[PDB]
């Protein structure tokens, strides 16, 4: 049925857990994405109900020493607090790493996206770090950003999808231009750029994935997979465009129910020169769901050089991997050993913490200290922000044959060109 494989050549290796925000009173339920990472400059951006926090990435990464309790949480670490008048539900960074978008809901005023010039964070002569441009979504409740993604190759371009079903493509330079929009009746639920950033794929309430040029002129429809019946109707919850004809697509119950659990589906598409149907493979619940209280959300990302997909989910304490096979076409679950997994911790009140944000650092330069005597070269670090306000870093050690080191040395941010309010 679901293809699976004991992988002894991959392990997640936990670094110390680091508290960023104070534990909340209630479990945060809404769809959110609160971690961003500058891999160009080595910064991490964390957000919550309670401000925005920026750290040099290496400050957040602390290795266990022999003797230390690997379950002890470090209390704080030096970073910068930028006060925010309202709670943040989404953070993202442009592909040049110079624009941070912060999405906020105000009960009074509804939603707004603040855009920060990332140099301002480094500008010692600004005691207050203000955004240089806002974008106000006239909407109040239906104005919650539920997916928002910067273009991987056009630094000024960002795609934003709202709760009411509407969508917009924005251009953010020294100010904010609306380039394209589609109204709420289109029913967008999720959004994702092509690898080269030439098209936008949007998931939809009706279960389809439509492709678009950035001008939002429609290019290709992926139908709702045949295995779903009419009396079990579904919606795209999240989508990841991996290759031109390859996607990860997550389906969830159309009606919003939290009880049913989402299916991660890999989809291979035919070409113009083929009249094959679409191949779908249901891997189902690779991140096992312990929680039915939160809005569903899969955090998906592809690591080309490793040809695999990392997956986390708002309802799960576990991170899962779907790898391409030696085959080069099909996918398989990687089943990892007990002490080499990536799981969010149990809170001190004995509840499960769950993911609010997920990123990978490639600027780590420190070597992994294994034994007293053994040391491995630096690895990428998976970082999860939890519902409890704790950051959870794990080295990703891929010892599979032929994999080239992904580490990339970071640069200094020059204040030149900083945009002003």
């Amino acid at each position: 049925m679901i293809p699976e494989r004991e992988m002894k050549d991959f392990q997640f290796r936990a670094l110390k857990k680091v508290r960023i925000f104070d534990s909340p009173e209630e479990l945060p339920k809404e769809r959110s994405s609160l971690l961003a990472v500058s891999n160009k400059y080595g910064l991490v951006f964390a957000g919550g109900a309670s401000g925005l926090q920026i750290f040099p990435t290496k400050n957040l990464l602390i290795q266990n020493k022999p003797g230390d309790d690997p379950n002890k949480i470090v209390d704080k670490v030096q970073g910068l607090l930028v006060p925010m008048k309202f709670p943040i539900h989404h953070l993202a960074l442009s592909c040049d790493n110079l624009t941070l978008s912060a999405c906020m809901m105000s009960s009074e005023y509804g939603s707004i996206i603040a855009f920060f010039d990332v140099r301002t964070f480094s500008n010692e002569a600004k005691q207050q770090k203000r955004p240089f441009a806002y974008h106000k979504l006239l909407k109040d409740a239906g104005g919650m950003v539920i997916d928002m993604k910067w273009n991987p190759t056009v630094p000024s371009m960002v795609a934003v999808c709202l709760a009411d079903g509407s969508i917009a493509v924005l251009q953010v330079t020294e100010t904010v231009k609306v380039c394209a929009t589609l109204p709420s009746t289109v029913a967008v639920t999720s959004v994702c750029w092509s690898p080269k950033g030439k098209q936008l794929a949007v998931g939809k309430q009706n279960g389809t994935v439509v492709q678009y040029l950035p001008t939002l002129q429609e290019k290709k429809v992926i139908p709702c997979p045949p295995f779903y019946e009419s009396d079990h109707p579904v919606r795209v919850l999240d989508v990841l465009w991996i290759g031109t004809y390859v996607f990860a697509i997550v389906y969830a119950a159309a009606d919003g129910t939290l009880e049913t659990s989402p299916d991660v589906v890999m989809a291979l598409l035919p070409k113009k020169e083929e009249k094959h149907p679409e191949i779908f493979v249901n891997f189902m619940e690779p991140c096992y769901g312990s929680c039915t209280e939160r809005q569903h959300h899969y955090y998906l990302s592809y690591i080309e050089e490793w040809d695999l997909v990392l997956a986390a989910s708002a309802a799960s304490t576990e991170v899962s991997i779907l790898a391409r096979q030696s085959d080069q076409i099909n996918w398989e679950s990687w089943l990892l050993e007990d002490s080499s997994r990536a799981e969010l911790p149990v809170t001190d009140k004995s509840d499960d913490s769950l993911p609010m944000g997920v990123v990978v650092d490639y600027t780590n330069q420190v070597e992994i200290t294994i034994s007293d005597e053994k040391t491995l070269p630096p690895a990428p670090v998976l970082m999860l922000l939890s519902t409890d306000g704790v950051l959870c870093p794990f080295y990703m050690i891929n010892q599979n044959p032929g994999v080239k080191s992904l580490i990339k040395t970071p640069e200094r941010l020059s204040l030149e060109g900083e945009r002003q309010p």
């Binding site: 936990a14 690997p70 379950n71 096992y288 312990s290 002490s339 997994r341 149990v346 499960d352």
Partner: protein
């Protein structure tokens, strides 16, 4: 075999006003005949120092929970194997006792001890929920005891639907100090534990006992008797 110890067991009973310590024979414990025979076949004669206090609590009527600390070779394993074997009913072909080991290689070691001491239970069978077991989805374990490492055990109880944890009568955590020191194991164990029934007997054993380990022990063994034996 048994390591020497001049020292004495310290005992905090769960019940302050209900003194019931010290058995100096196995015959006293009213074991099932096939269990006492198991013991006999192993060459045991007297309970060990730690066993003398631990067994009356674990085998009380009804059984009671325990946090026990003593060094290697005190008889901890033997003591909890007795515990699990005395609750097991082989007639019922599904997991009833659940033992967590910090490593693969100890999961098997303990297994052998279980198998040897349970020699005269007819149709007693063990499952090993450890790295590289073969089981396909859909299956359900019919072995009456399961031993394994916390991550795989958790999967079997949850994800994979291999074990119904609401049916377990005895839960053991061997080597708490080592357990906690291993990535993942603390949270994994807590997650297993929370889905066991109220009336499950819980037992926890460690050589060391620093505050991390103690605080862990408290989350895992409600209403415990606590036993310490100072190292020698």
């Amino acid at each position: 075999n048994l390591v020497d110890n001049t020292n004495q067991v310290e005992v905090l009973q769960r019940d302050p006003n209900s003194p019931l310590y010290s058995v100096k024979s196995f015959e006293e414990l009213r074991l099932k005949p096939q269990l006492l025979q198991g013991v006999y076949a192993m060459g045991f004669n007297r309970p060990s120092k730690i066993q003398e206090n631990a067994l009356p609590l674990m085998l009380a009527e009804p059984p009671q929970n325990l946090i026990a600390q003593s060094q290697s070779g005190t008889g901890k394993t033997a003591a909890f194997v007795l515990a699990m074997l005395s609750q097991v009913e082989p007639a019922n072909k599904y997991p009833q006792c659940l033992c967590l080991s910090p490593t693969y290689e100890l999961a098997l070691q303990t297994g052998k001890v279980i198998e040897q001491m349970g020699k005269f239970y007819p149709e007693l069978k063990l499952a090993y929920a450890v790295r590289g077991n073969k089981l396909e989805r859909g299956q359900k374990i019919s072995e009456q005891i399961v031993i394994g490492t916390p991550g795989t055990v958790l999967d079997w109880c949850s994800k994979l639907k291999f074990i119904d944890p609401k049916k377990i009568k005895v839960f053991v955590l061997d080597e708490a100090d080592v357990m906690i020191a291993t990535q993942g194991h603390q949270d994994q164990s807590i997650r297993i534990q929370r889905m066991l029934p109220r009336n499950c007997q819980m037992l926890l054993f460690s050589a060391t006992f620093e505050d991390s380990v103690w605080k862990f022990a408290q989350k895992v063994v409600p209403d415990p008797n606590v036993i310490k034996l100072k190292r020698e």
